[PDB]
Design an enzyme around this catalytic site. Structure first.
Site, short mmCIF file in Angstrom:
data_model
loop_
_atom_site.label_atom_id
_atom_site.label_comp_id
_atom_site.label_asym_id
_atom_site.label_seq_id
_atom_site.Cartn_x
_atom_site.Cartn_y
_atom_site.Cartn_z
N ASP A 84 34.23 51.30 31.84
CA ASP A 84 35.29 50.27 31.43
C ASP A 84 35.72 50.32 30.16
OD1 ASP A 84 35.88 47.02 32.67
OD2 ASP A 84 36.71 47.87 30.93
N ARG B 244 26.37 47.22 30.63
CA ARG B 244 27.07 46.70 31.73
C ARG B 244 28.47 47.42 31.81
NH1 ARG B 244 30.39 43.90 27.85
NH2 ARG B 244 28.90 43.83 25.99
N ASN B 245 28.77 48.24 30.95
CA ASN B 245 29.97 49.20 31.17
C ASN B 245 29.90 50.44 31.47
OD1 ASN B 245 31.94 47.13 30.67
ND2 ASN B 245 31.93 47.13 28.69
N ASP C 231 33.29 48.47 23.16
CA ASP C 231 32.38 47.78 24.13
C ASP C 231 31.27 48.68 24.85
OD1 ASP C 231 31.28 45.47 25.02
OD2 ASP C 231 32.65 45.29 26.44
C1 LIG Z 1 28.66 46.68 39.38
C2 LIG Z 1 28.89 47.59 40.40
C3 LIG Z 1 29.70 48.75 40.68
C4 LIG Z 1 29.69 49.59 41.66
N1 LIG Z 1 30.62 50.63 41.52
C5 LIG Z 1 31.70 50.87 40.82
N2 LIG Z 1 32.62 51.97 40.92
C6 LIG Z 1 33.50 52.26 39.87
C7 LIG Z 1 33.93 51.27 39.10
CL1 LIG Z 1 35.15 51.53 38.19
C8 LIG Z 1 33.04 49.91 39.09
N3 LIG Z 1 33.72 48.77 38.23
C9 LIG Z 1 33.34 47.52 38.56
C10 LIG Z 1 32.60 46.94 39.55
N4 LIG Z 1 32.26 45.76 38.89
C11 LIG Z 1 31.70 44.54 39.48
N5 LIG Z 1 32.76 45.46 37.76
C12 LIG Z 1 33.14 46.63 37.29
S1 LIG Z 1 34.26 46.98 35.98
O1 LIG Z 1 35.24 45.89 35.57
O2 LIG Z 1 35.23 48.07 36.12
C13 LIG Z 1 33.10 47.22 34.70
C14 LIG Z 1 32.32 45.78 34.43
C15 LIG Z 1 32.32 48.56 34.82
N6 LIG Z 1 32.32 49.61 39.78
C16 LIG Z 1 29.12 49.39 42.82
O3 LIG Z 1 29.12 49.87 44.11
C17 LIG Z 1 28.16 50.76 44.69
C18 LIG Z 1 26.67 49.90 44.87
C19 LIG Z 1 28.73 51.19 46.12
C20 LIG Z 1 28.14 48.22 42.59
C21 LIG Z 1 28.01 47.52 41.88
C22 LIG Z 1 27.07 46.35 42.20
C23 LIG Z 1 25.89 45.93 40.96
C24 LIG Z 1 24.81 45.01 41.55
N7 LIG Z 1 24.94 44.89 43.06
C25 LIG Z 1 23.81 43.91 43.38
C26 LIG Z 1 26.13 44.18 43.45
C27 LIG Z 1 27.43 45.27 42.99
#
Ligand SMILES: Cc1cc(Nc2ncc(Cl)c(Nc3cn(C)nc3S(=O)(=O)C(C)C)n2)c(OC(C)C)cc1C1CCN(C)CC1
Length: 266
Positions: free
Chosen positions: A146, A129-130, A125
């Site tokens: 991811d 987005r990942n 994948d």
């Molecule tokens: C998408 C997103 C990720 C992170 N940080 C983050 N760090 C480490 C991980 Cl492992 C991680 N994983 C994660 C977050 N989300 C929503 N989904 C996942 S997921 O399932 O692991 C996969 C889809 C990558 N995310 C983030 O942090 C900083 C701004 C503080 C902000 C956003 C923003 C994207 C767009 N903004 C407007 C809001 C959230």
């Protein structure tokens, strides 16, 4: 490995992940991303088995308390798709983002892909987005955040990132990862557009199986497009592996006619 939760303080919701919502969080004071909920185990141990600079680090899990958490490296730049979209050059402030920044992201993800290939791990994948960013500015590092569907071996399959043998046969190999990487590259160089922008999944299946492939993203340099087209060869044996891809990416970074090329403005 196990982190009690006495130490785990949530701070802010980040968005909705594969299983559920993800939080910016702390531990003691480690700032972390707290990912929530077989599979539980599949996801967890997987990303924790790896040690590479372009793969997100696993800090630990909180599993004896519910909800279940995996605690990952907090990537302060957020996800790559959002980054490219919010950093598109505009008429209002038009941006610092240049072609070399795009090639660095590409290079960082391929280096993580190459680590996986070398460890015989199939992602399944690879998509923007990942992918995550350490921070939003110059010196940002892109990391794979991811892991795909080794949670597996569906209008829910990411058909637009998949090569024919994967969508028609369920065959996934490193060469099916190479295909997905080509599509990511398109995502990178279009500055975050949806692949096959005007088509549905069903149309794409039909398009791709009969030889149709995407046009270059706007202003995409020839040498970068050529990497994509090679990633999308019909037969997996004709696709490059990731050491070749990285070699090619690296030549791109050394050619001024590539790196001087201006991004389209929105
Ligand atoms: C998408 C997103 C990720 C992170 N940080 C983050 N760090 C480490 C991980 Cl492992 C991680 N994983 C994660 C977050 N989300 C929503 N989904 C996942 S997921 O399932 O692991 C996969 C889809 C990558 N995310 C983030 O942090 C900083 C701004 C503080 C902000 C956003 C923003 C994207 C767009 N903004 C407007 C809001 C959230």
């Amino acid at each position: 490995k196990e982190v009690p939760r006495k130490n785990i303080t949530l701070i802010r919701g980040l968005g909705h992940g594969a299983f559920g919502e993800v939080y910016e969080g702390q531990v003691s004071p480690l700032q972390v991303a707290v990912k929530t909920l077989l599979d539980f185990l599949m996801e967890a141990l997987i990303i924790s088995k790896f040690n590479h600079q372009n793969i997100v680090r696993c800090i630990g899990v909180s599993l004896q308390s519910l909800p279940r958490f995996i605690l990952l490296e907090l990537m302060a730049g957020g996800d790559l798709k959002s980054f490219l979209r919010e950093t598109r050059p505009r008429p209002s402030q038009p941006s610092s983002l240049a072609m070399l920044d795009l090639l660095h992201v590409a290079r960082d993800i391929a280096c993580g892909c190459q680590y996986l290939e070398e460890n015989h791990f199939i992602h399944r994948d690879i998509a923007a987005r990942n992918c995550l960013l350490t921070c939003p500015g110059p010196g940002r590092v892109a990391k794979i955040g991811d892991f795909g569907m080794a949670r597996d071996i569906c209008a829910m399959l990411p058909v637009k990132w998949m090569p024919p043998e994967a969508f028609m046969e369920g065959i996934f190999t490193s060469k099916t990862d190479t295909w997905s990487f080509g599509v990511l590259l398109w995502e990178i160089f279009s500055l975050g557009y949806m692949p096959y922008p005007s088509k549905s999944n069903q149309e794409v299946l039909e398009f791709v199986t009969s030889g149709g492939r995407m046009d270059p993203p706007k202003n995409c340099p020839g040498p970068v497009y050529r990497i994509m087209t090679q990633c999308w060869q019909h037969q997996p044996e004709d696709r490059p592996n990731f050491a070749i891809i990285l070699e090619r990416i690296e030549y791109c970074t050394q050619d001024p006619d590539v790196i001087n090329t201006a991004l389209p403005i929105e």
